[PDB]
Design a protein around this ligand. Structure first.
Ligand SMILES: [Zn+2]
Ligand SMILES: [Zn+2]
Lengths: 208, 142, 95, 551, 168, 258
């Protein structure tokens, strides 16, 4: 009864999980559910008022204790269920955010240039804050003892020394260690894989 | 709306005419309009209008009897009507005068339409009339 | 054997004729004109092209079709307005 | 970053790019362009002596160059600006205050479905606008009042007291009894009967037995909370109570909207992302009170006439004292002419536009005397009803609310005689550190008094009533489009959803006052000259004021 | 353009339509064009910008002046008496016309695209008829009006109106 | 589902005669159609030229040379793709209404059913096109069909507005034929009162200047000449393009011509 609304929220989470599960490429979180969450907040506030009222009505001594225990337990259980639903929804959304934050080579995400995967207004303000400190944590990890290893690098094993690549978007001359790449659009390169991993990750190159 | 309506209608019947055409110039349109003539919320007060009519009539009559100042007043009344810098100026008065002049021009065109002739143009200062006759030498009497 | 086409032709003349025919019907007339009568001019043009065993419709055939359609509409009027309608529609059929 | 070495030897970037690449592209950052690489050769060659085999110097230089790109947003490619950021770096080893006009203010729409503000790209930046780009589009006329209704209804529905709730009007079409709480525009139908209107529909209103809540103004064209009973024998909502929507403080309003930089001085926002900032507010509140009471900006009495001679003499006497302690800002407000300037068909006398020009040339003579006031004071020019462009149409009447600044053609050398002069629209927003002040000039009390509902049933109380209505309605124009036309796309300039910290509300028809309300301060300069007395008031950002008079 | 403008003058007869239209087609046969081509139709080369009711102080004459069609020696001189005008007055009247036009556009009324009718609501989405709200004065007209003022202010030297255009 | 096409009696709609004398379908069959479209020709020149050009492009071969391009780019899809989309949508989704959608639909039903009562009382004859509960269920079905396009699991007010607009365009337009004059028993006194009021209004108000509906009601009704049907008399005078114009949010009544 009281928790029947929160179940709906959990159902929404399930749908999001499917979009996370069936994702060939990175996806965007849907709109926040502040209205449903505020409805659970209102009903848990009403439950708190009911618990208070039971407290006074018992402590004036008009009702039997065994009777009051049952509604006390019911209100406590309903509040626990609502907390569980809200926490599960929040943790799923948090996990997806952490995954995206890791899958953009660290960086500040929305403030700096982003891969346009996510719109600003989908996330909540607290989620926007959380993402910022998580990105800072990734950043000061990457400057730790593991400087030589790029903790935000590619996770597919290297098995091809020389690859053919094609430019997707036009750009200017870019210096690389001991040379220069000229990014004329609709041109093909035959070069070592290590040099162009960064440019492939950022969408300026195609193929491998 | 009433202070933003200062456009006058015109007639521009175009073509090639093989009859005689007369080019008349109509002067004293506004003073003639003034001298001749609850529900409505956009009209000037009738009493002040009649006062102005009487003033113009007496001024014209004295101007006929060799009066320079009366002639100057009659000539300058039209300039006075449209000037906001002149005191006692009312936008309703200007709208009233323009609206009656507009009706007067159409009535004059209709009056010309009584005899065999056709309007070609009308600009408050020039009127072009198409006559039935074919030679200019035969229109002195008409 | 023959199947003529309509590659090069004057669209503006046909559009003007159709618009004039539509206007002069509701104003004074009792011969229903719709989009269904626009296509009859093109059909008659293709027929006149077939008569010549030609694979392309020329300007003469289209003009002849327009003249036929106009004469079929003018002569089904009242005697009062027929003389005015014939004069009004005479500019299109100059040839 | 240091000097005094032997000489700047020139070396090719080919022998410099590996270190820059390893420091920047690999670890953090990327895109060292060829031109940018060549640019980064000069400064590293400035101290080139005995290097490329040295220790920390080059690495620290690259670290410092990376510091700018973490600090500033910038981008990816490094261009000829690379020297421009090192200029900033050597820079590292009052301000931040602005005056925002009506036209330059950022535009924000509101989505009722999302309870959130959406940015609107400005047509001037991207649109060509070479011939006509200021002109609005018809769709704004359809949403002008819908936007007001959405903002006010959100606030009403988020109030603490309400949780009877407000019901849409069309939900009353079958009911024959009960009570309802209706919120909507109060106006007159095309039949001449009083009516209430909401986006859902409209209904006629009966005032024959209404008991209003005294303490504010009930003028047509404003949102009203109403209570009563609906009768289906006709179509009438018999009113029994009437009030106005409650007001909301800006501290509780900001949290709902997050930390949007509406009058963004922290930065700017585009269609991609928005800007928020919280930590700097504490330190800049500290700086506001960090013994900066020396700051002193002064609003003169409104409606000062330049053509009059006594007014000019009084202004000279006032500037005599202002020279001693130069104000931080000096706001000249009110109509600068005592007669509307129009086409002036008569050319026997000198033209009124030329007279307008001449009256702004005597100001240069009177101002050039006082050199210190020129040197360290910024002047803000507010227009009035009888200025140049408006009076060409309204002929002295009050028309469109967004009023453009005085043309720069007829006032040219006052920019030379004075150092800092800014012309501003009729409604403007002074952004001073962590403070927003609104400048507005019109006669509000007369129009309130003339247009009241007049229910069928010490002077400073009117000031409190005016303040409460203006602040609770959250809008500077609680009037229909009939009384005052409004530019369709500039209406956001006139909507006070976040209550300003300090308000400048001058009315010649209302006596001077100093009132406080839910999180703001309202002051009323007015009537520059009165009873042979010339008055002007001082206000300090530390919330103290003074009145200074000079016969 | 010469042949089109020469034929247009003959065309204003209403009694020799067929005779002139045959000659027009024959002349258009010299070019590779057809008698009903859109490129072969005559349009007025000039726009119009009429300032009504200008006063001659020494003549007491009411005249309407059009700044586009009228040739020079007439823009800056009265008709009845050849007395020169004052230029800044003309510029101020042009500015008055421009600002009045902008105001008139800003205070227009709305209409239904199908039910030609006036909008009688302050907050509505469309007609009770399924339709849309359109304007009585479309934007294109006022854009063209602002366009012609710029050219008028540049052919003749009107500094004040040129400044007024750039402060918008 | 049933898609039907038919012609009226006499071929054309003949807007001069009553709707009941034009539609031969009884109320029993007309209540089972969710949307009824009455189609008429307006004989406008601009539309005629546009249609003529469009039809000539079809015949001269210029049609295909355009159509493929749009079907290629982003604006059209082939018949087979649309068929597969239709079957996928019908076999995958079945939306549901929201609490606010029902509230918005109930008020619209009440409004559209009230209007019919005034129309029938004024015309003193029963309506040929009926409005019933099936007309509410039709709007519900249209809302859910609109939701089905986007594979949405819930129907909201966005779809409700478009469904209401479609119903107004289809059936309410057909019901509201608004006869200018039928010369029947209804408004029988109006057969002379219309001319009487027109003369009284055209003698009071010259070709310039304006009045108000408030005054034109109060003063002309103090003499007890009110008929309760003068709302459309002003519009009929406006139809003459000279007698009446309505301006300033409908408050101002302007005399524009003879
Ligand atoms: Zn003269
Ligand atoms: Zn409509």
């Amino acid at each position: 009864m009281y928790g029947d609304l929160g179940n709906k929220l959990v159902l929404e989470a399930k749908r999001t999980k499917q979009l996370y599960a069936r994702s060939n490429q990175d996806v965007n979180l849907p709109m926040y559910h502040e209205d449903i969450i505020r409805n659970i907040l209102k009903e848990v506030s009403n439950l708190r008022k009911n618990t208070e009222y039971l407290k006074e009505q018992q402590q004036l001594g008009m009702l039997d204790d065994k009777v009051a225990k049952c509604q006390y337990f019911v209100t406590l259980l309903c509040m626990e269920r609502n907390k569980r639903c809200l926490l599960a929804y929040q943790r799923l959304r948090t996990d997806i955010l952490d995954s995206m934050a890791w899958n953009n080579n660290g960086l500040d995400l929305m403030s700096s240039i982003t891969f346009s995967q996510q719109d600003t207004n989908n996330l909540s303000h607290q989620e926007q804050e959380y993402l910022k400190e998580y990105c800072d944590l990734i950043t000061d990890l990457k400057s730790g003892d593991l400087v030589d290893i790029d903790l935000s690098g590619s996770l597919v094993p290297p098995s091809d020394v020389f690859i053919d690549v094609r430019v997707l978007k036009d750009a200017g001359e870019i210096q690389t260690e001991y040379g220069v790449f000229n990014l004329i659009k609709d041109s093909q390169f035959f070069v070592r894989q290590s040099d162009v991993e960064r440019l492939i990750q950022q969408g300026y190159l195609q193929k491998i | 709306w009433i202070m933003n309506d200062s456009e006058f209608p015109k007639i521009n019947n175009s073509g090639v005419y093989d009859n005689v055409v007369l080019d008349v110039g109509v002067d004293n349109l506004t003073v003639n309009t003034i001298l001749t003539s609850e529900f409505v919320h956009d009209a000037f007060s009738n009493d002040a209008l009649n006062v102005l009519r009487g003033m113009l009539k007496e001024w014209w009559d004295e101007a006929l009897k060799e009066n320079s100042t009366a002639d100057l007043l009659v000539n300058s009344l039209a300039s006075w009507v449209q000037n906001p810098n002149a005191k006692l100026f009312d936008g309703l008065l200007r709208y009233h005068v323009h609206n009656l002049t507009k009706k007067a021009l159409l009535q004059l065109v209709n009056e010309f339409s009584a005899l065999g002739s056709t309007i070609v143009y009308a600009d408050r200062n020039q009127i072009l009339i198409k006559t039935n006759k074919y030679s200019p030498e035969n229109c002195y009497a008409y | 054997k023959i199947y003529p086409k309509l590659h090069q032709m004057d669209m503006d003349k046909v559009s003007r004729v159709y618009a004039d025919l539509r206007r002069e019907s509701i104003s004074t007339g009792s011969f229903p004109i719709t989009v269904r009568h626009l296509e009859s001019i093109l059909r008659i043009a293709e027929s006149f092209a077939k008569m010549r065993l030609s694979e392309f419709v020329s300007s003469y055939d289209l003009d002849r079709a327009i003249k036929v359609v106009v004469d079929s509409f003018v002569d089904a009027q009242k005697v009062s307005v027929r003389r005015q309608l014939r004069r009004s529609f005479a500019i299109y059929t100059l040839g | 970053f240091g000097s005094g070495n032997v000489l700047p030897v020139k070396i090719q970037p080919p022998l410099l790019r590996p270190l820059a690449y390893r420091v920047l592209s690999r670890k953090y950052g990327l895109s060292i362009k060829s031109d940018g690489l060549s640019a980064l050769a000069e400064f590293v060659g400035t101290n080139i002596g005995a290097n490329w085999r040295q220790g920390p110097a080059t690495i620290k230089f690259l670290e410092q160059f990376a510091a700018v790109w973490k600090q500033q947003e910038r981008g990816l490619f490094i261009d000829q600006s690379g020297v421009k950021e090192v200029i900033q770096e050597m820079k590292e080893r009052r301000d931040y205050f602005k005056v925002i006009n009506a036209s330059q203010q950022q535009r924000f729409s509101y989505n009722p479905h999302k309870m959130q503000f959406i940015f609107v790209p400005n047509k001037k930046q991207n649109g060509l606008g070479g011939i006509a780009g200021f002109l609005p589009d018809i769709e704004d006329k359809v949403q002008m009042f819908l936007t007001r209704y959405y903002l006010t209804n959100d606030r009403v529905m988020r109030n603490e007291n309400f949780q009877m709730s407000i019901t849409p009007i069309k939900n009353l079409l079958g009911r024959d009894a009960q009570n309802f709480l209706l919120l909507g525009l109060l106006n007159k139908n095309f039949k001449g009967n009083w009516s209430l209107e909401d986006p859902s529909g409209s209904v006629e209103i009966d005032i024959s037995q209404t008991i209003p809540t005294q303490g504010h103004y009930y003028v047509p064209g404003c949102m009203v909370l109403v209570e009563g009973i609906y009768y289906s024998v006709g179509n009438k909502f018999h009113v029994t109570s009437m009030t106005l929507p409650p007001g909301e403080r800006r501290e509780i309003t900001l949290e709902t909207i997050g930390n949007l930089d509406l009058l963004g001085i922290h930065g700017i926002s585009n269609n991609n992302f928005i800007a928020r900032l919280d930590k700097d507010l504490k330190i800049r509140l500290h700086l506001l009170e960090k013994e900066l009471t020396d700051h002193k900006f002064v609003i003169l009495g409104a409606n000062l006439f330049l053509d009059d001679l006594k007014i000019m003499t009084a202004l000279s006497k006032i500037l005599q004292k202002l020279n001693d302690d130069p104000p931080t800002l000096l706001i000249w407000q009110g109509s600068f002419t005592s007669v509307p300037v129009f086409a002036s068909m008569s050319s026997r006398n000198i033209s009124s536009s030329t007279q307008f020009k001449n009256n702004f040339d005597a100001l240069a003579t009177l101002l050039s005397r006082f050199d210190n006031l020129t040197e360290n004071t910024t002047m803000i020019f507010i227009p009035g009803p009888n200025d140049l462009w408006g009076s060409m149409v309204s002929l002295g009447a009050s028309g469109t609310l967004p009023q453009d600044p005085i043309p720069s053609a007829f006032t040219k050398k006052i920019n030379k005689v004075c150092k800092n002069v800014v012309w501003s629209s009729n409604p403007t927003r002074i952004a001073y550190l962590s403070q927003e002040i609104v400048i507005f000039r019109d006669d509000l009390s007369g129009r309130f008094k003339r247009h009241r509902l007049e229910f069928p049933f010490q002077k400073v109380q009117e000031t409190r009533k005016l303040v409460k209505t203006i602040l609770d309605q959250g809008h500077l124009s609680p009037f229909l489009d009939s009384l005052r036309p409004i530019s369709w796309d500039l209406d956001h300039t006139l909507t006070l959803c976040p209550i300003p910290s300090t308000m400048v509300l001058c009315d010649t028809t209302s006596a001077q006052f100093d009132l406080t309300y839910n999180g703001c301060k309202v002051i009323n300069p007015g009537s520059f000259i009165h009873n042979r007395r010339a008055r002007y008031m001082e206000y300090v950002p530390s919330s103290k004021k003074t009145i200074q008079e000079e016969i | 353009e010469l042949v089109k403008s020469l034929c247009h003058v003959m065309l204003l007869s209403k009694s020799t339509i067929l005779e002139i239209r045959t000659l027009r087609k024959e002349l258009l046969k010299i070019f590779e064009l057809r008698e009903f081509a859109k490129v072969a139709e005559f349009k007025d080369p000039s726009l119009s910008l009429v300032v009504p009711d200008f006063l001659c102080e020494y003549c007491f004459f009411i005249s309407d002046i059009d700044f586009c069609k009228a040739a020079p020696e007439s823009i800056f001189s009265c008709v009845r008496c050849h007395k020169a005008f004052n230029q800044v007055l003309l510029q101020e009247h042009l500015i008055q016309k421009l600002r009045s036009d902008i105001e008139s556009y800003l205070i227009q009324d709305l209409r239904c695209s199908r039910c030609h009718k006036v909008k009688r609501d302050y907050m509505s989405a469309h007609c009770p008829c399924a339709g849309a709200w359109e304007g009585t004065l479309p934007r294109e007209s006022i854009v063209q009006k602002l366009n012609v003022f710029k050219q008028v202010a540049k052919y003749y030297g009107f500094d004040i109106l040129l400044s007024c255009i750039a402060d918008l | 589902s049933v898609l039907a096409a038919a012609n009226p009696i006499y071929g054309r709609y003949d807007d001069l005669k009553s709707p009941g004398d034009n539609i031969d379908f009884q109320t029993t069959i007309l209540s089972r159609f969710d949307m009824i479209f009455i189609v008429k020709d307006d004989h406008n020149e601009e539309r005629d030229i546009s249609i003529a050009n469009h039809v000539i492009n079809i015949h001269t071969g210029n049609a295909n040379a355009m159509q493929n391009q749009q079907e290629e780019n982003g604006s059209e899809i082939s018949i087979e793709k649309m068929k597969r989309y239709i079957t996928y949508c019908r076999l995958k989704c079945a939306p549901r209404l929201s609490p606010q959608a029902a509230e918005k639909l109930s008020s619209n039903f009440v409004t559209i059913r009230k209007q019919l009562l005034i129309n029938e009382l004024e015309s003193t004859e029963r309506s040929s096109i009926p409005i019933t509960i099936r007309q509410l269920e039709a709007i519900i079905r249209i809302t859910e069909s609109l939701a089905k396009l986007e594979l949405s699991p819930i129907a909201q007010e966005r779809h409700v507005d478009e469904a209401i607009r479609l119903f107004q365009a289809s059936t309410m337009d057909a019901a509201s034929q608004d006869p200018i004059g039928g010369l029947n028993q209804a408004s029988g006194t109006s057969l002379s009162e219309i001319r009487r009021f027109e003369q009284e209004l055209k003698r009071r108000l010259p070709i310039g200047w304006s009045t108000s509906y408030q005054t034109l009601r109060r003063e002309f009704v103090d003499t007890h000449r009110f008929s309760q049907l003068a709302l459309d008399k002003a519009l009929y005078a406006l139809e003459k393009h000279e007698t009446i114009q309505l301006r300033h949010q409908g408050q101002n009544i302007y005399r524009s011509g003879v």
